[PDB]
CSV table of C-alpha atoms (C1' of nucleotides) and ligand atoms in Angstrom, one decimal:
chain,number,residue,atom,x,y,z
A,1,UNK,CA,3.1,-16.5,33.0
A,2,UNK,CA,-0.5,-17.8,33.1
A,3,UNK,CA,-1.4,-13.3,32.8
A,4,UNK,CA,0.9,-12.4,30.2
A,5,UNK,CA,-1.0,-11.4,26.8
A,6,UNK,CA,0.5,-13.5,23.6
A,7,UNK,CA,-1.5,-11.5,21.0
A,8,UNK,CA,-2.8,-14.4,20.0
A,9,UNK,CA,-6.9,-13.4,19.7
A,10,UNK,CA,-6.9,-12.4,16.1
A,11,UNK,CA,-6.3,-14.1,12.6
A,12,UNK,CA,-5.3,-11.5,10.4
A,13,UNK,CA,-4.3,-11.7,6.8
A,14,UNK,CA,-2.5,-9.2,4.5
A,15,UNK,CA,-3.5,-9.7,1.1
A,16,UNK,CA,-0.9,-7.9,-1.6
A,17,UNK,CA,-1.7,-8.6,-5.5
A,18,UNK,CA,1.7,-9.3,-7.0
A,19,UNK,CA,3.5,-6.3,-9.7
A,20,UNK,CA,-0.1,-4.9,-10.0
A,21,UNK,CA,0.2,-2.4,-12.4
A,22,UNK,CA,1.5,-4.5,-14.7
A,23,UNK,CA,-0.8,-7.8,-14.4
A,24,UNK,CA,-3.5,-4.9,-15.0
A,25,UNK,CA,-1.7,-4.6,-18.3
A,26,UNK,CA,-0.9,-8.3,-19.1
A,27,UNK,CA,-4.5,-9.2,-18.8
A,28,UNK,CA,-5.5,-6.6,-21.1
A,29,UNK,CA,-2.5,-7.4,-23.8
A,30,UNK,CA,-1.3,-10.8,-23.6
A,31,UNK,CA,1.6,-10.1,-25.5
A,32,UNK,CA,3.4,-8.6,-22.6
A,33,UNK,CA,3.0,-12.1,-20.6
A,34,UNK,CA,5.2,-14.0,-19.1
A,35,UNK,CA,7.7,-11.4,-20.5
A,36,UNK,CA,9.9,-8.6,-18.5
A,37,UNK,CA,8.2,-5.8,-18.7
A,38,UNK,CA,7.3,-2.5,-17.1
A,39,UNK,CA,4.6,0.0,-16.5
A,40,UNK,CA,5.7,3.4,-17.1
A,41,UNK,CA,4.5,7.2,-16.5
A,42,UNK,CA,5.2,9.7,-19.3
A,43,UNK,CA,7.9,8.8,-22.8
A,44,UNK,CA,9.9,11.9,-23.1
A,45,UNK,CA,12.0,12.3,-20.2
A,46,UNK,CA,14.2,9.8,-20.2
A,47,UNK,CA,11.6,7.1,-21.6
A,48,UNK,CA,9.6,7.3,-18.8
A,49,UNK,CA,9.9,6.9,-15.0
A,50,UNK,CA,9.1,3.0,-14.0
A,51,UNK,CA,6.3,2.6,-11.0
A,52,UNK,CA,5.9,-1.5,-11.8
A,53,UNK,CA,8.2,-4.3,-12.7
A,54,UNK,CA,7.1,-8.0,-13.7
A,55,UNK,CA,9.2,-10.4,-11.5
A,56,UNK,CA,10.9,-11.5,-15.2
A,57,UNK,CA,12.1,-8.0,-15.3
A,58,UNK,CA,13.5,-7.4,-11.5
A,59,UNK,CA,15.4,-11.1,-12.3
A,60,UNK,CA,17.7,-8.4,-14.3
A,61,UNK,CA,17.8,-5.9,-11.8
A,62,UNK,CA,14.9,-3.6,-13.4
A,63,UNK,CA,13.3,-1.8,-10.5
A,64,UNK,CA,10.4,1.2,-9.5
A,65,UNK,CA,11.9,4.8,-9.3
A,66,UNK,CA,13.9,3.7,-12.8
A,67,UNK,CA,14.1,6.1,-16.2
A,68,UNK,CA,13.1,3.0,-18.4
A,69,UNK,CA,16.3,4.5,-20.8
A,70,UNK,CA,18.6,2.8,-18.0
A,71,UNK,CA,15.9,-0.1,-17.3
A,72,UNK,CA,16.7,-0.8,-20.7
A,73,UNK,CA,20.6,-1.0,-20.1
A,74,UNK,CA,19.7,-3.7,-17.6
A,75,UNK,CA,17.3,-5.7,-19.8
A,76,UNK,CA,17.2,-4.8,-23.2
A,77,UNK,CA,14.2,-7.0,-24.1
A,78,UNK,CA,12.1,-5.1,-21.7
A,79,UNK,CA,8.5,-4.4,-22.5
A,80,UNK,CA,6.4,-1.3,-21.7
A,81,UNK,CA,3.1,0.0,-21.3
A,82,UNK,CA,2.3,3.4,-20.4
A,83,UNK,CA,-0.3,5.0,-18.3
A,84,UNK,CA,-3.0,6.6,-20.0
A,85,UNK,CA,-2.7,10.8,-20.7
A,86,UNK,CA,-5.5,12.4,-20.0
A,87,UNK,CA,-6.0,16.2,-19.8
A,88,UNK,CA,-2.1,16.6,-19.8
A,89,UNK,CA,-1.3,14.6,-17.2
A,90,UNK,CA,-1.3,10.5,-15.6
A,91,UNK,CA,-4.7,8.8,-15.6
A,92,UNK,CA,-4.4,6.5,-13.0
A,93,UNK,CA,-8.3,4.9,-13.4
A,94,UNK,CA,-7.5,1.8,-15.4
A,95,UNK,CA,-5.8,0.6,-12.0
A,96,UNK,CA,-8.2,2.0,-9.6
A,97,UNK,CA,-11.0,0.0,-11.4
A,98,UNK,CA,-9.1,-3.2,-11.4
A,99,UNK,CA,-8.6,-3.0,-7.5
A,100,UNK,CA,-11.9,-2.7,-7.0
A,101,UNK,CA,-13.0,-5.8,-8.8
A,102,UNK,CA,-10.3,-7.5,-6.2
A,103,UNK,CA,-11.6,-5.6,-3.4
A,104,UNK,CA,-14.9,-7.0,-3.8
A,105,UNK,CA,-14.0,-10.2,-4.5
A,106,UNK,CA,-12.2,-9.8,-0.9
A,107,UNK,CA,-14.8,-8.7,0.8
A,108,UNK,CA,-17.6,-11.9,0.1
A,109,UNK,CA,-14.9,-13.6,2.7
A,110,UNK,CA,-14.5,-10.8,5.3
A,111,UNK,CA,-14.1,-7.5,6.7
A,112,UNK,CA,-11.5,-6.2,4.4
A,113,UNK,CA,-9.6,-2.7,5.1
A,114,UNK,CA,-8.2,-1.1,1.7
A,115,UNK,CA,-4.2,-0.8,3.0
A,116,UNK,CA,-3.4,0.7,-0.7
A,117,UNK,CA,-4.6,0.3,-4.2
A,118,UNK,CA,-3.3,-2.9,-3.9
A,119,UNK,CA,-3.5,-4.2,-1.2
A,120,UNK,CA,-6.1,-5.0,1.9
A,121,UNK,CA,-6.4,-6.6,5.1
A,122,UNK,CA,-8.5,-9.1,6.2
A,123,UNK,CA,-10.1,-9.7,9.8
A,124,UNK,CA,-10.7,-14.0,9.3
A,125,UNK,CA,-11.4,-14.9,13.2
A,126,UNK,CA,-14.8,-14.9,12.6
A,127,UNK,CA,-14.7,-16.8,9.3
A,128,UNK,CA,-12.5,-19.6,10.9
A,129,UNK,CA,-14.6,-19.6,13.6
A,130,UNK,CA,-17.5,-21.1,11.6
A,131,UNK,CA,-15.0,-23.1,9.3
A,132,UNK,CA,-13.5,-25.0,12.4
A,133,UNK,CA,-17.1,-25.6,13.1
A,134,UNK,CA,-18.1,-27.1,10.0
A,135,UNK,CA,-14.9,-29.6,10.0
A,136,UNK,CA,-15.8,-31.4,12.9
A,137,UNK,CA,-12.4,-32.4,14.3
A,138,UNK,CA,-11.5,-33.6,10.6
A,139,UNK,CA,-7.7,-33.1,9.8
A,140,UNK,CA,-6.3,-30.2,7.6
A,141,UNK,CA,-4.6,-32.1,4.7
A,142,UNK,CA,-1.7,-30.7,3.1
A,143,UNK,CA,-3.6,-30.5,-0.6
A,144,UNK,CA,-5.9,-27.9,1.1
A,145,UNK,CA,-3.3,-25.4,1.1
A,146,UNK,CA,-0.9,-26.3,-2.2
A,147,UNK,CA,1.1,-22.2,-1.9
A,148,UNK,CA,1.4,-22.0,1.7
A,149,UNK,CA,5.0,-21.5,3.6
A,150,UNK,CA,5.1,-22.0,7.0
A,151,UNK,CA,7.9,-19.6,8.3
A,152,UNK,CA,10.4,-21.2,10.4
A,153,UNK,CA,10.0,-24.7,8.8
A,154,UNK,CA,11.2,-27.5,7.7
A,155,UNK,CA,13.6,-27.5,10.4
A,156,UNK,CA,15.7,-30.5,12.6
A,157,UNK,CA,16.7,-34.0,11.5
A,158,UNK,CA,15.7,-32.4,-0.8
A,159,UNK,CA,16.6,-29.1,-2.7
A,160,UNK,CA,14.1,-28.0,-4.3
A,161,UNK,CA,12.3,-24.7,-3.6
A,162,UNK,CA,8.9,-26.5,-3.8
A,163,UNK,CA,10.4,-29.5,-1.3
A,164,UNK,CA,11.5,-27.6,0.9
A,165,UNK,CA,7.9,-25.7,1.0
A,166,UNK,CA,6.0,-29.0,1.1
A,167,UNK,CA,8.5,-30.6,3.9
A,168,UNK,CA,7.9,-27.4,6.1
A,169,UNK,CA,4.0,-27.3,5.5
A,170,UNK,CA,4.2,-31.7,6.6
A,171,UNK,CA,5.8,-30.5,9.5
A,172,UNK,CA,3.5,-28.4,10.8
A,173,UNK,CA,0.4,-30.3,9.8
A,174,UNK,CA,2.2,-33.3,11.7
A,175,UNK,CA,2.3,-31.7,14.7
A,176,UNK,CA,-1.1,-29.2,15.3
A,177,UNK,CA,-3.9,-30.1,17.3
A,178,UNK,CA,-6.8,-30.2,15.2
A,179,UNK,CA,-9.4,-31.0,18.4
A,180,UNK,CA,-8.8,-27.5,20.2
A,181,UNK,CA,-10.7,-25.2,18.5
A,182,UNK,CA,-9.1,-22.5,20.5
A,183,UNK,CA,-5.6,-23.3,19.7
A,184,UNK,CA,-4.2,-19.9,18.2
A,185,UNK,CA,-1.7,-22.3,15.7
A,186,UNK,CA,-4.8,-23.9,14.8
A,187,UNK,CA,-6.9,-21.1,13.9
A,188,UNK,CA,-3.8,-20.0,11.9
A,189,UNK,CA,-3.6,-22.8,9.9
A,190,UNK,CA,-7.3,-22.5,9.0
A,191,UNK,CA,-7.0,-19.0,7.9
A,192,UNK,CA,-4.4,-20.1,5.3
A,193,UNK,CA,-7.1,-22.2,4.1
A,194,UNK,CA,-9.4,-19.7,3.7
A,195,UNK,CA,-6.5,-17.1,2.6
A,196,UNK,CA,-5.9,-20.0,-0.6
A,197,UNK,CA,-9.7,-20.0,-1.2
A,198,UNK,CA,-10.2,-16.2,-1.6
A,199,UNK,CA,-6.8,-16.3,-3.5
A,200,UNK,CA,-8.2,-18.7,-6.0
A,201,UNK,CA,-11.3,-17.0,-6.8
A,202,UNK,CA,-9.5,-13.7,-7.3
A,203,UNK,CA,-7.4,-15.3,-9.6
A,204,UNK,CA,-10.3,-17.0,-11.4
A,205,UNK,CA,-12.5,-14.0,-11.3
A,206,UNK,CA,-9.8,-11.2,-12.6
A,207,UNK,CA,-6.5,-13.3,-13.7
A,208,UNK,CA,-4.6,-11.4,-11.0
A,209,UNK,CA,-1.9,-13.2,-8.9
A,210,UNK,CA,-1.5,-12.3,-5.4
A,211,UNK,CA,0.6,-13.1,-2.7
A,212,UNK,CA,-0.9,-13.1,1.2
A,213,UNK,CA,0.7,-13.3,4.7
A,214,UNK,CA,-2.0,-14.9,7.7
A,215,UNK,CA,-0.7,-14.1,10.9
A,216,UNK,CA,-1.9,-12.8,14.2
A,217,UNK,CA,-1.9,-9.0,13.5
A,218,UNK,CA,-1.5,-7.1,10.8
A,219,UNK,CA,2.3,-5.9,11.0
A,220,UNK,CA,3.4,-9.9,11.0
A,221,UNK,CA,0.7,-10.4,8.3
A,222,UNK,CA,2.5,-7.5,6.2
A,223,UNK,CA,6.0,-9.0,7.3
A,224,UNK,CA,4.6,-12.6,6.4
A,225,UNK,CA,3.7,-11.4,2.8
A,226,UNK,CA,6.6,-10.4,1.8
A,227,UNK,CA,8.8,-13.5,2.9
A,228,UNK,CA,7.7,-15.9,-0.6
A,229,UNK,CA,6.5,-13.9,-3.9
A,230,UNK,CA,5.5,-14.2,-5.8
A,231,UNK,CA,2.1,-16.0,-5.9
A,232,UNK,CA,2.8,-17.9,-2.6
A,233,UNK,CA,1.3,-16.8,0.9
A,234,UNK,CA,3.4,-17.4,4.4
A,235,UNK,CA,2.1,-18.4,7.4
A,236,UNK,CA,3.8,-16.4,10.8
A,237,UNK,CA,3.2,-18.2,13.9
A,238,UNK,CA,3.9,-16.8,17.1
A,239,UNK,CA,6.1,-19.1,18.2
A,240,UNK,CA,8.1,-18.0,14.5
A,241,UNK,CA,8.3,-14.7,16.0
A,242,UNK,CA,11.8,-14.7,18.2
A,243,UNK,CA,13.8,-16.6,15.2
A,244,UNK,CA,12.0,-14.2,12.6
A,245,UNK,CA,12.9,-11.5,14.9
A,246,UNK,CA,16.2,-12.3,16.0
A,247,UNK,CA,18.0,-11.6,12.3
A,248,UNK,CA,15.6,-9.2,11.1
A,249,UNK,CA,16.3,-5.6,9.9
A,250,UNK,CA,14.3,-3.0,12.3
A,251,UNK,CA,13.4,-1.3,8.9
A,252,UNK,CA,11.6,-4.3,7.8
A,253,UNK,CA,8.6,-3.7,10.1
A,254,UNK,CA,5.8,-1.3,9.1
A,255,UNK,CA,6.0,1.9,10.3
A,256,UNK,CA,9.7,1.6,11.2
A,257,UNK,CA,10.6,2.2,7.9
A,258,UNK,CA,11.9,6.3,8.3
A,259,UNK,CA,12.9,8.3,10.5
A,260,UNK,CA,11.5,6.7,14.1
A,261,UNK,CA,13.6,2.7,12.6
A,262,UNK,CA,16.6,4.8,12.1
A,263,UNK,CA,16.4,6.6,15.6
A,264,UNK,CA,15.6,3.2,17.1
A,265,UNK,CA,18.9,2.1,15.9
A,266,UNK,CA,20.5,4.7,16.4
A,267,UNK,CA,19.7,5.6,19.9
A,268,UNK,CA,20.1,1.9,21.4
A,269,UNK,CA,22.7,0.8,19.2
A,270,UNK,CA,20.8,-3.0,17.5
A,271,UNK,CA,20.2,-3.9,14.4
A,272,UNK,CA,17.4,-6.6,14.8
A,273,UNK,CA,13.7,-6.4,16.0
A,274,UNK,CA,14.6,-9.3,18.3
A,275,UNK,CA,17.3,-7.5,20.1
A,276,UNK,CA,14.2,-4.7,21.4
A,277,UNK,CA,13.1,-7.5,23.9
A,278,UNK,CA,16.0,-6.1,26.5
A,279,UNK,CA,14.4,-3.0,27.0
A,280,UNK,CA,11.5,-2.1,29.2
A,281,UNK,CA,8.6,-0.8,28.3
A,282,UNK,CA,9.8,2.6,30.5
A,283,UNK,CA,12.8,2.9,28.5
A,284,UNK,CA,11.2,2.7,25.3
A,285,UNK,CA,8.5,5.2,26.1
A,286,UNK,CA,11.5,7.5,27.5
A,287,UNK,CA,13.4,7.4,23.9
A,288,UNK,CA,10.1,7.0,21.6
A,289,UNK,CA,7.2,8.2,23.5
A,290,UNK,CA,4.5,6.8,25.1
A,291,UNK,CA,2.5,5.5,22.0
A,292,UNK,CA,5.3,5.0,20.6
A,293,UNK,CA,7.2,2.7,23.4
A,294,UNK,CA,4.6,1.1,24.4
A,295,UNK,CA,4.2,-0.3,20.2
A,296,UNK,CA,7.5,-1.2,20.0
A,297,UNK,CA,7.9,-3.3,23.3
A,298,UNK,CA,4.8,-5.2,22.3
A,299,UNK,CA,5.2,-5.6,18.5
A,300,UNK,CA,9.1,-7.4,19.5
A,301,UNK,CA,7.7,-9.5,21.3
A,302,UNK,CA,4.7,-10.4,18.0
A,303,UNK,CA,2.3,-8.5,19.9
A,304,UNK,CA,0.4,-5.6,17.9
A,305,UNK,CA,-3.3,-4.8,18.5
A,306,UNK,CA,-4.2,-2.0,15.3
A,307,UNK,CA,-7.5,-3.5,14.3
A,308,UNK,CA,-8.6,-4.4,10.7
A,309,UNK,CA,-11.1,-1.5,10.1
A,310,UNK,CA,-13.9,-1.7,8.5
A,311,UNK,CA,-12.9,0.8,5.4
A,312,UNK,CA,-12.7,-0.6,1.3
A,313,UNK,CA,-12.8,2.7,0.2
A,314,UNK,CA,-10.7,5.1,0.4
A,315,UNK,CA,-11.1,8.2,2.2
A,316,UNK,CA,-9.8,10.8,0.1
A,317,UNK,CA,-10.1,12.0,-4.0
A,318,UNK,CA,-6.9,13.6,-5.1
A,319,UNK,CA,-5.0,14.9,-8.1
A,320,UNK,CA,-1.8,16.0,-8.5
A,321,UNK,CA,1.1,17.3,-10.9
A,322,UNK,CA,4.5,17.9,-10.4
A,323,UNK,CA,6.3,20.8,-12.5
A,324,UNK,CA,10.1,19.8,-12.2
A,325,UNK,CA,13.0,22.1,-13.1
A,326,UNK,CA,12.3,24.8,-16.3
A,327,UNK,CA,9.0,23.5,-16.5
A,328,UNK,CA,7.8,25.1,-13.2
A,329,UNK,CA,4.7,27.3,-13.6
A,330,UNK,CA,5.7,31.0,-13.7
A,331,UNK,CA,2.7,32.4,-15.0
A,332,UNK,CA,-0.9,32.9,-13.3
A,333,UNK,CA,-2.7,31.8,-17.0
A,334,UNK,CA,-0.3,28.4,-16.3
A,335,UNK,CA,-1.1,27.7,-12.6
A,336,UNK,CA,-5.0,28.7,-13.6
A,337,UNK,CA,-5.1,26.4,-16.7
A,338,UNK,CA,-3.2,23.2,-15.0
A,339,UNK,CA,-5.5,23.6,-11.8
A,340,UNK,CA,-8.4,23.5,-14.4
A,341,UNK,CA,-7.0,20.1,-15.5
A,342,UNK,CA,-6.6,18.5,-11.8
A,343,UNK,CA,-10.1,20.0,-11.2
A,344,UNK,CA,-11.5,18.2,-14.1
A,345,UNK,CA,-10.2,15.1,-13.4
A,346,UNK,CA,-11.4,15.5,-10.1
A,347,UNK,CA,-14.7,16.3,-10.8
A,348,UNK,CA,-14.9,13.4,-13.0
A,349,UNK,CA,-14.0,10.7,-10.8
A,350,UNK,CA,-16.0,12.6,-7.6
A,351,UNK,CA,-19.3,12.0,-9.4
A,352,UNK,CA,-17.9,8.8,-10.4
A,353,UNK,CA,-17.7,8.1,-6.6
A,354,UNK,CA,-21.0,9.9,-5.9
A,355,UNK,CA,-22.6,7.7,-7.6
A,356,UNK,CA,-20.9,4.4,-7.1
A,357,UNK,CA,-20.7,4.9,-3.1
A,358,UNK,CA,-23.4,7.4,-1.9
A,359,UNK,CA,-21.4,10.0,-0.7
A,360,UNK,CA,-20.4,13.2,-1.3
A,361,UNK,CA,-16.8,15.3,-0.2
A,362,UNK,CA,-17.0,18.3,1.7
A,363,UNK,CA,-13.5,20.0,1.8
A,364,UNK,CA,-11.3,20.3,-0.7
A,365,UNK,CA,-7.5,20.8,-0.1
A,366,UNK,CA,-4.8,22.9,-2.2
A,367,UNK,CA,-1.7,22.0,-2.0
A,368,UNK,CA,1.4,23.1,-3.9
A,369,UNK,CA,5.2,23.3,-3.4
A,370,UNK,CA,7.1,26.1,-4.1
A,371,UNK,CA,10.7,25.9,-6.3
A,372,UNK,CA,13.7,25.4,-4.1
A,373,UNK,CA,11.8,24.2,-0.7
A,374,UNK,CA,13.2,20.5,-0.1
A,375,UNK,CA,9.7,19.6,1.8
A,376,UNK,CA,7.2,17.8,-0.6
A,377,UNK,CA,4.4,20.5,-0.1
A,378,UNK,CA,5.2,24.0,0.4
A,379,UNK,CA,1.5,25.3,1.5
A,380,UNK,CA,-1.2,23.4,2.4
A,381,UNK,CA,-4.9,25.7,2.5
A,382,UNK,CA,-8.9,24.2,2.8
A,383,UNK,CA,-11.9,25.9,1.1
A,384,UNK,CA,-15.3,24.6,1.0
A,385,UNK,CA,-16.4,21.9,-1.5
A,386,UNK,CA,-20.3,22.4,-2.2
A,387,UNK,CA,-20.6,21.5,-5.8
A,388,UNK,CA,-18.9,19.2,-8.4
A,389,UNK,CA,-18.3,21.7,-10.8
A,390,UNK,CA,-14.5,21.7,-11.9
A,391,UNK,CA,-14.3,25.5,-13.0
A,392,UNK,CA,-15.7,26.5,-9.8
A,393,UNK,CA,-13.4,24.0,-7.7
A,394,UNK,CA,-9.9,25.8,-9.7
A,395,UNK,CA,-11.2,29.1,-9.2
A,396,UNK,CA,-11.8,28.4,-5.6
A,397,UNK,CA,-8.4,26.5,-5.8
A,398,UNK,CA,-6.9,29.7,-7.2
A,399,UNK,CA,-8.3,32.3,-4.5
A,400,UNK,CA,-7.0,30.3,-1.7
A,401,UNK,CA,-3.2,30.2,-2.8
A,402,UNK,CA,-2.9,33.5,-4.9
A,403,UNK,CA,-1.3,35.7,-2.5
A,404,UNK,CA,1.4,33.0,-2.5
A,405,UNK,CA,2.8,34.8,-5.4
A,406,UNK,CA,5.6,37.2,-4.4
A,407,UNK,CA,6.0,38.5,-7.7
A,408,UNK,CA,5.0,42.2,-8.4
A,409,UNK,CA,4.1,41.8,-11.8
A,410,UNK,CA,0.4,40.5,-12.2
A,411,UNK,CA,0.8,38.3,-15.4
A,412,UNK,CA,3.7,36.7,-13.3
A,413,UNK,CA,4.3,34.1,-10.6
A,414,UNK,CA,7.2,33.5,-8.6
A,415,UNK,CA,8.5,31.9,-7.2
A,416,UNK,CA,7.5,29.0,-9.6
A,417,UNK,CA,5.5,26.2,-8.5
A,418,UNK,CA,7.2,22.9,-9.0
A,419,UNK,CA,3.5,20.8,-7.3
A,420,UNK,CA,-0.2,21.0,-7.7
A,421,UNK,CA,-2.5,18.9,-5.8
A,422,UNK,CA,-6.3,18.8,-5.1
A,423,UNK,CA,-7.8,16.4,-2.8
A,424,UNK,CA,-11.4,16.2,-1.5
A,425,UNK,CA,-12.1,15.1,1.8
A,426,UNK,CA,-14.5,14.9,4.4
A,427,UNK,CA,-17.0,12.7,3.0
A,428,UNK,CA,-20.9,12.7,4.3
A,429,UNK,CA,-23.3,10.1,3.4
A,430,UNK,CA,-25.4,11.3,0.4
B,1,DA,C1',13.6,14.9,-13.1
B,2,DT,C1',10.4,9.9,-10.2
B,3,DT,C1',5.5,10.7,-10.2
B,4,DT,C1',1.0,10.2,-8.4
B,5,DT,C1',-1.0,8.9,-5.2
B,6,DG,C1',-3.2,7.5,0.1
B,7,DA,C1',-3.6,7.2,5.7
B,8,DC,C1',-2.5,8.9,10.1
B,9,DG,C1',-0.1,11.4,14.0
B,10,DC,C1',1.4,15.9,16.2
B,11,DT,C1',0.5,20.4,17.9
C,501,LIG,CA1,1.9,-5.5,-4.8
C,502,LIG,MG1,6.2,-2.8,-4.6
C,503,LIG,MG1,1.0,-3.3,-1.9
DNA sequence: ATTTTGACGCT
């Protein structure tokens, strides 16, 4: 009752730029516009392996993980555009550059935390703090938020998408209380103002479309992104949350998406987040764990409490190549020269970084995978990172994982490694 | 033969 926590303290919004990869590319050739296309890494295997589909493209089933030979089957009018090749392998920089211009468009509004390349959250209670301040018990109109969905509305006593969008939005404008400045629905409903303000400017300032969920916390923000792209943002309520919740897949939740969603639903026989609410939070913690439990009897019920942090960098450098099937280095002059690659690039963007950011990594971590192991990395060893210097970082690179060789021949290496990966860590201010 | 990333929890 008048004790009981709603989660209700926070506005949160998750901010996720639609088929990034390939607006990056549309901006720069405007040919691919408006057209199904795709952005693909590597040509000769199979045409290429698919990481990012223009919503034209998925409309004919084109999706991530794809060879673009059979993405082609599906839509044989798609369009590509490769990732730059440099130094033998995928040069993802193009995109990393472009999310920063949107990161710092985000962060003029508020405390953003980098979630991915692209996408961030966004702590607004502050900002709509001072923004219900400066109305002055004025209304919200409808026109100051023209690509907002409110979940769960229209509904009660047109079929149009668009309709249907503004009828629900009416709705709820109709019935909020614009004189209580603490009303959570309120505060809301201001954040999705704000959330259409820092969507136009990204979109003037870099041409990139984004979709956006506001919501109390950041799983229902994440949830309420997803529910209307592209280039629309959703509005979750708490009162949404048991009709959301009562049809919706556990594995559509973040962080429920694996193995812990699947033993969820295996171990209490549901289906829907909703359907947790019968359980205590004793019985949770006994199947899950404490941290665990304790998550999931708040987060049915809308309640999460993860805060936005203050991060819009991220925290580690890393490079990596896999070696799949024959071409799997068996040689010590091939594991030494591709490490040399990763190590260039690395030292390339590090002092990139240095530079940009004032800081400087400390540790770097070697990583590789050995053939036939089904685990993604095989061996996982640290070493010291003192100086950007790319032949000294492979060498180094090199000494730590060389007695992984079983082979008794010294020119040779088995078994053969299918992964490389270098990634510095442990940044200190510099 | 998706590939190339990135953050965080467990012990
Ligand atoms: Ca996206
Ligand atoms: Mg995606
Ligand atoms: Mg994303």
């Amino acid at each position: 009752g008048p004790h009981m926590a709603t989660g209700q303290d926070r506005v949160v919004a998750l901010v996720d730029m639609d088929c990034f990869f390939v607006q990056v590319e549309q901006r720069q050739n405007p040919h691919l516009r408006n057209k199904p296309c795709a952005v693909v890494q590597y040509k000769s295997w199979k045409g290429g392996g698919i990481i990012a589909v223009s919503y034209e493209a998925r409309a004919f089933g084109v999706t991530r993980s794809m060879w673009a030979d059979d993405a082609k089957k599906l839509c044989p009018d798609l369009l590509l555009a490769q990732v730059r090749e440099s130094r033998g392998k995928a040069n993802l920089t193009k995109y990393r550059e472009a999310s920063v211009e949107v990161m710092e468009i985000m962060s003029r509004f508020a405390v953003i935390e980098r979630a991915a390349i692209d996408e961030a959250y966004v702590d607004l209670t502050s900002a709509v703090q001072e923004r219900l301040q400066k109305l002055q018990g004025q209304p919200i109109s409808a026109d100051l938020l023209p690509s907002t969905y409110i979940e769960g509305l229209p509904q009660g006593p047109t079929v149009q998408k668009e309709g249907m969008r503004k009828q629900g939005l009416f709705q709820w404008l109709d019935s909020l209380q614009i004189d209580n400045l603490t009303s959570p629905d309120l505060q809301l409903t201001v954040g999705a103002v704000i959330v259409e303000e820092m969507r136009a400017a990204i979109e003037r300032e870099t041409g990139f479309q984004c979709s956006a969920g506001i919501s109390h916390n950041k799983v229902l923000a994440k949830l309420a992104c997803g529910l209307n792209k592209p280039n629309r943002q959703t509005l979750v309520s708490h009162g949404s949350v048991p009709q959301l919740f009562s049809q919706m897949p556990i594995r559509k939740i973040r962080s429920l998406g694996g193995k812990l969603g699947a033993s969820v639903i295996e171990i209490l026989g549901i289906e829907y987040m909703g359907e947790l609410t019968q359980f205590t939070e004793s019985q949770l913690q006994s199947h899950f764990g404490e941290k665990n439990g304790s998550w999931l009897y708040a987060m049915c019920r809308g309640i999460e409490h993860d805060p936005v942090k203050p991060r819009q960098l991220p925290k580690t450098i890393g490079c990596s190549k896999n070696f799949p099937g024959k071409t799997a280095l068996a040689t010590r002059e091939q594991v030494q020269w591709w490490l040399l690659q990763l190590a260039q690039e690395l030292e390339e963007r590090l002092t990139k970084d240095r530079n940009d950011n004032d800081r400087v990594a400390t540790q770097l971590v070697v990583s590789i995978r050995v053939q036939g192991d089904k685990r993604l990395s095989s061996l996982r060893r640290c070493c010291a990172l003192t100086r950007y210097d790319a032949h000294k970082m492979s060498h180094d690179a090199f000494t730590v994982i060389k007695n992984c060789n079983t082979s008794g021949i010294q020119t040779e290496w088995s078994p053969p490694l299918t992964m490389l990966f270098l990634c510095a860590t442990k940044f200190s201010a510099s």
